[PDB]
Amino acid sequence: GSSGSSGVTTAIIHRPHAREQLGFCVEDGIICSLLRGGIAERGGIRVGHRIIEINGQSVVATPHARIIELLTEAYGEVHIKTMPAATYRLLTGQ
Numbered sequence: 299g300s301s302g303s304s305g306v307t308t309a310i311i312h313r314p315h316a317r318e319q320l321g322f323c324v325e326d327g328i329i330c331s332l333l334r335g336g337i338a339e340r341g342g343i344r345v346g347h348r349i350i351e352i353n354g355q356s357v358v359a360t361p362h363a364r365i366i367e368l369l370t371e372a373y374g375e376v377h378i379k380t381m382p383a384a385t386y387r388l389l390t391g392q
Contacts, residue, residue, distance in 0.1 A: 305385075306350075309342025311376040320369075324349065327362050328383065343378065350386060351379035358386075 311320070321336030321343075322329050328348045332338050349365065350358040353372040357365050369376065 307342065307344070307347065307380045309338075309378050309380060311337050311341040311343070311378060313337070313373045313376055316373055324362065324365070324369075327357065327360070327365055329380070341376075341378070343380065346382070347380035348383040348386065349378065350381045353377055 313320075319333070319336075320338065321333030322338035322345075323331040323333075329338075329343060329345045332343060332345050350356070352365065352368055353376060355368060357368065360368075369378070
């Protein structure tokens with residue numbers, strides 16, 4: 299691609315199996331720890347960043363509980379949109 303708007307980080311997780319862990323630990327819609335040598339790292343998951351959208355679904359105002367049910371339902375090609383709470387907030391602060 300040519301038109302690139304550097305801003306929100308987008309990662310892609312490869313979940314070939316359902317009975318397989320994820321590696322990345324999410325807390326209140328915000329990743330904290332990441333499994334070393336797993337998928338998250340491969341896809342593009344980085345702790346500290348907050349989740350605002352998943353599999354094409356706005357979860358910025360969605361309760362973790364649900365977020366989990368969603369991500370889980372999404373297998374194989376999972377699109378997780380990560381964003382730094384700092385920037386996001388500052389953006390939607392005005």
